[PDB]
Amino acid sequence: HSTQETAIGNFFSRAGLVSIITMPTDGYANWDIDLMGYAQLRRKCELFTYMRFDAEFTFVVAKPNGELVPQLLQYMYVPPGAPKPTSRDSFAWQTATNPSVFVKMTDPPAQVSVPFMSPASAYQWFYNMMGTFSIRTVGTKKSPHSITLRVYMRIKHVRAWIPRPLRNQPYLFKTNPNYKGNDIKCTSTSRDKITTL
Amino acid sequence: HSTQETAIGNFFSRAGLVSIITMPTDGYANWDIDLMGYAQLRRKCELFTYMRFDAEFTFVVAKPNGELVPQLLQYMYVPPGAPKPTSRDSFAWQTATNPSVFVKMTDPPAQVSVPFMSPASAYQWFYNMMGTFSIRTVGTKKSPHSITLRVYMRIKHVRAWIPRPLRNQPYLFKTNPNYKGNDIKCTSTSRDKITTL
Amino acid sequence: NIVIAYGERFFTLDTKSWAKDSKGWYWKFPDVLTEVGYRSGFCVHVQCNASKFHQGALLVAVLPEYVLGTIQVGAVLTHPYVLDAGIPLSQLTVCPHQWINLRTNNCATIIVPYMNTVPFDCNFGLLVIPVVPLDFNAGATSEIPITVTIAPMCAE
Amino acid sequence: NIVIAYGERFFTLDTKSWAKDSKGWYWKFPDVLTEVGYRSGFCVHVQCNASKFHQGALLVAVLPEYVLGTIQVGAVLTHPYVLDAGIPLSQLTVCPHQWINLRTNNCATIIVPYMNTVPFDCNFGLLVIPVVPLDFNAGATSEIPITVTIAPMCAE
Amino acid sequence: GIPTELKPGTNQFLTTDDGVSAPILPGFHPTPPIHIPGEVRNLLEICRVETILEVNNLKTNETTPMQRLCFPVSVQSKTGELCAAFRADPGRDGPWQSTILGQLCRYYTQWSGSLEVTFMFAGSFMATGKMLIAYTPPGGSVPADRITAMLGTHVIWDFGLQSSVTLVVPWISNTYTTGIITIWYQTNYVVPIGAPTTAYIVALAAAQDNFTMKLCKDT
Amino acid sequence: GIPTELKPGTNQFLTTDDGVSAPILPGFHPTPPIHIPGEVRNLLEICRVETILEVNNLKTNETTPMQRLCFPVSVQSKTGELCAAFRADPGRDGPWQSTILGQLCRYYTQWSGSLEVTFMFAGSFMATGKMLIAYTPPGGSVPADRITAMLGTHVIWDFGLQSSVTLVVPWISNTYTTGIITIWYQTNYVVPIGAPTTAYIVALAAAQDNFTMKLCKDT
Amino acid sequence: GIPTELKPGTNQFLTTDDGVSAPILPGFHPTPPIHIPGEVRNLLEICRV
């Protein structure tokens, strides 16, 4: 067979869940875009040092229990270097330089592609701020429906540089690669003797 | 006329029902993909020995009585060699390597094509594990709607090898071609004399 | 009368005694040569020695992936109408077969090539079924020997 | 035995004493030459002087963007199995490396070019880890010196 | 955007559509196929082999089903009498349920073409005789004796020289159309001393190269 | 407008689709890429470097994990005895968990190809001896002594002349298939006065150019 | 009709799309432009004084 399955493009395909947002009955959320949000997609991204790609988002929105209601929403993308909305009726929601989409809940979900937004030539995990999202319901009255949604993120046009040893220790913080010094767990499994196959 | 109707491709067309799933008010089901699920499509597949094809599924979902409700569902396909979901809120539902679809009940049904997933060159019924499906409703609350659905499966790009005599005895188990030894029914119908036309 | 399956030294096994109430014998390949004297071919030879006063007919036929069901010498078939696998005897001629009719000819040989989903790896069987039973008069020989001769070809 | 990283005067630092219970040393580039005697290359030379009665093995390997974690002379590694960064020692050979085995050869040099996302701007490190510990008998020299020689190339 | 329209017939699920769907694994590379002998490209390659019929389907042969594959001849039978008779329809029940031609035509509705029936003698070498294999046209009547069966389509088969006779049916159709083949005793069965008195005939059946079928139907 | 139709399969969200979406910033011009050395175009460029195994994974080495990279030889060991033995599977747990080949094959299901194992001596220059690196075929048994291990696939490695031996595994597969490599003492470990009595061997492992894998699976 | 499909991302309103819409006056002919001096084609012509 060919060696197409182990390419760098197919290794970062099959978009999975990167965030979960619950908005019960404030009215607005601010979710920062970060790849290292789960245990997945952090050990896989720390295999290399320099990465260059674009993003692709999808906002699957529903009620807490299955059903959908005819409600109009707005997903505003804040560029890197722009002030975030601090209230529900703030002046940042009407800013023309912040692009937004207007979809309903009885609508197939939105498909937003975010390009390479770094001032350098590639991203760097070991020493970016790709952007933040803001989700609110339109109108001047409180909508009587609990809203929840999940964001799925794809990674297209993957280019990698400088391979790195894979992390075998559990993470503690999400800013630095720290470990616990009270114990060092072994990478391999142990046996009773070196002669027992 | 031509001999197009008796081809091997048209003999396995006209996709029929292969499964029926009832989910009343657990919340998740696990249906293993198997061709020998009914009396049909088992006598027709035992005519040969080696088969090579791909699959094509359709999930027609409704209520137990006709109507539809605005509910969001998820049909996750588990690859061969992956752990199955054991709970409703398990970690397998957020696995990026397991592809899934997100359709509603007021949506035309999903069309999922499953390729040839065998490590050999063809399937073998006489001596595969094509995959399993997992169906659940999204959300963290119990949806107050009884859900039922049926799966239809098409077989495309049919290639057959080593024809085999057709089975004329009823089946007992679904792993081995067993029969009952207390009686052997005749394939043909009997008459009173050999001279009576 | 060389028949080749689907258009593409000499080991001698034991001799089976064709009785008056025989049902059939089957051999599993390539298990029959694993104690006497993977990818290979096969060239089997089934022949019997009978006189001109005996009558009967045999049906030698290979069967790839012949699995059984629960009710070197080879086992004896219990129900030869369903072949202990649910498939009928009358439709066995869709496989590469040969008829051993005692009126005319006393030999049968089948050329069987390699056949598997994987090129390098029990592949097939060999059923000998007395469709027409043996009949004779009093004083003649009650048993007729059936000898199987197997010849492997291009082993890898 | 010239190794070049990814296929593309002479300053002498201090000498480190390879003891029997040494763990490892690391140097940060280009911080090691900021008090003695931006875009540039590097040509480092690691060599040690030992006799034919000492045994051991060293693993010299560069590591771009080597950041540490909380539990000219260079610092001493505390946990050399995880390199104080969570990455294992056994997978360090994916970087441009060299083995200093005391049985055969006593020199190691790595050609390191410029590597950054911006062309004009601490870039990489240099880990020397005693994988096989030093062993000798009584009466021999207890310390073995390790000298690092760095040579910059095409500075801009 | 471009102007579009929704014709009547959308958002429906037909079961016999040639619809290219999205694959569930785009990056997967399947196993490349190798050469496996015995490839079946059409169902007529299975319907053109001579398989055994069951002409002797009596009521007493239900306990021992091995005797249903052969019908016996004997010495005590007189000349000019009938031995066996059977229909020539693969679809309806009877002797044609045991062949692979009559089991694959159950998956269809209409069939039309020519067949062939090959008999085989399994008697002693020192025995000789003559049999008459008559075929009546469809729409006629069954013959009462050997005389009126000779006037139609027939073949004289003597097993003292040959061992297999092949009778070809000209045409059958299904939209009565019955092709009754009768086995008559031309001469008596003579044997020397030592030879067995009874013998057995095994009948085979296969289709020709002009036997087509259509209108697929699930049983 | 033009007549259109809605096939079954619309308004659904597949996670593995190649769908070109609308960009959120049409007027933005990204930073042009420059030449950065060490570009990884495929995952097999990482699986073809010799990384250190952990053969000496005993129960007492859990506190000091630095001793798991080397297994010792000594003078007091007799001749014709076993030193170490380990499996040759990158997927399952054991000595192959510490290499980059056995950590990237956890992201897949099936793998097939050839490997190589490179040993390295770290002893004194004045010491000499002989070791036997035997490999059993898959499906066989572990050898009991040095005699039956010599009859299979093996290489005699003397560290008085060389310092590194490379043993190549012919083929492994995963759909037991175990490739047990045993380290035998051919001759005893001889040293002069002043030389150390114990030495250490570091084992490396890498894959060849015909080691492919498929069926990606998230851990 | 021709077989079609609805990809995820329909019935949404993005604010930065290059979408050609239907004109509200198809039969209207606008005033033809004349030569007016001092045309600014880019914002850097103002940042260079």
Numbering used by the authors:
A (entry chain A), B (entry chain A): 73 to 97, 104 to 205, 228 to 297
C (entry chain B), D (entry chain B): 30 to 37, 62 to 90, 102 to 135, 155 to 204, 210 to 244
E (entry chain C), F (entry chain C): 1 to 175, 189 to 232
G (entry chain C): 1 to 49
Reproduce passages from the article:
Coxsackievirus A16 (CVA16), a member of the Enterovirus genus within the Picornaviridae family, is one of the major causative agents of hand, foot and mouth disease (HFMD) prevalent in infants and young children. Cryo-EM studies show that 9B5 and 8C4 target distinct epitopes located at the 5-fold and 3-fold protrusions of CVA16 capsids, respectively, and exhibit differential binding preference to three forms of naturally occurring CVA16 particles.
From the same CVA16–8C4 dataset, we deduced three conformational states, namely C1, C2, and C3, at the resolution of 3.05, 2.91, and 3.36 Å and population distribution 15.5%, 27.0%, and 57.5%, respectively. For CVA16–8C4 C3, the radius of viral capsid is 170.5 Å, slightly larger than that of C1 and C2 (162.2 and 163.0 Å, respectively), and the two-fold axis channel in its capsid is open, while that in C1 and C2 capsid is closed. Moreover, the VP1 hydrophobic pocket is empty and collapsed in C3 capsid, but filled with the pocket factor in C1 and C2 capsids. Additionally, the viral RNA density is present in C1 but absent in C2 and C3. Moreover, structural comparison revealed that the protomers of the CVA16–8C4 C1/C2/C3 showed the most similar architecture to that of mature virion, compact empty particle, and expanded empty particle with the overall Cα RMSD values of 1.098, 1.178, and 0.937 Å, respectively, confirming the identity of these viral particles. It appears that 8C4 Fab binds only to the native mature virion (C1) and compact empty particle (C2), rather than the expanded empty particle (C3). Such a large movement toward the 8C4 Fab may create clashes between the CVA16 capsid and the 8C4 heavy chain, thus prevent 8C4 binding.
